Amino acid sequence: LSEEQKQMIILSENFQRFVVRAGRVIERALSENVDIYT
Amino acid sequence: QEVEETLKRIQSHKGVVGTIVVNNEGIPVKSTLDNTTTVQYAGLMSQLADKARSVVRDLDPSNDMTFLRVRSKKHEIMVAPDKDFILIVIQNPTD
């Protein structure tokens, strides 16, 4: 909710490593939907 | 960092329009959209992700949804939900 808090999370190891998971999962979908070689 | 350098690596994928992060509660954390809008998506998508995850759970309790994506005429929304956070990305397909 609050401001300073969003910050605390953004710099956690909960989030730092979740963002990298989802990240990888997605980055496939992303390039199926789109021809990156064109 | 990898977080800021990844969250941005997505935002610039060919065809990406927006990107948002939420939590179990449906509260936007970081998000590349005007905030009044970023509210919409979080609320709805979180609901959608719940139902879906729940549907997946009722078809089978030993299963958990990993990834969901709804395609419209205009674009595709995806949503990777991961316990406490969920990443929404709107993309513009080609198709």
TrEMBL record, chain B:
Roadblock/LAMTOR2 domain segment(s): 3-91
Organism superkingdom: Eukaryota
Keyword Cytoplasm: yes
InterPro entries: DYNLRB1/2 (IPR016561), Roadblock/LAMTOR2_dom (IPR004942)
BP-aspect Gene Ontology terms: dendrite morphogenesis; microtubule-based movement; mushroom body development
Main localization, broad class: cytoplasm
UniProt entry tagged with the keyword Aminoacyl-tRNA synthetase: no
Alphabetized UniProt keyword annotations: Cytoplasm, Cytoskeleton, Dynein, Microtubule, Motor protein, Transport
Role: Acts as one of several non-catalytic accessory components of the cytoplasmic dynein 1 complex that are thought to be involved in linking dynein to cargos and to adapter proteins that regulate dynein function. Cytoplasmic dynein 1 acts as a motor for the intracellular retrograde motility of vesicles and organelles along microtubules.
Database matches in PANTHER family: DYNEIN LIGHT CHAIN ROADBLOCK
Membership in a protein family: Belongs to the GAMAD family.
Name listed for the protein in its UniProt record: Dynein light chain roadblock
Organism of origin: Drosophila melanogaster
Gene of this entry: robl
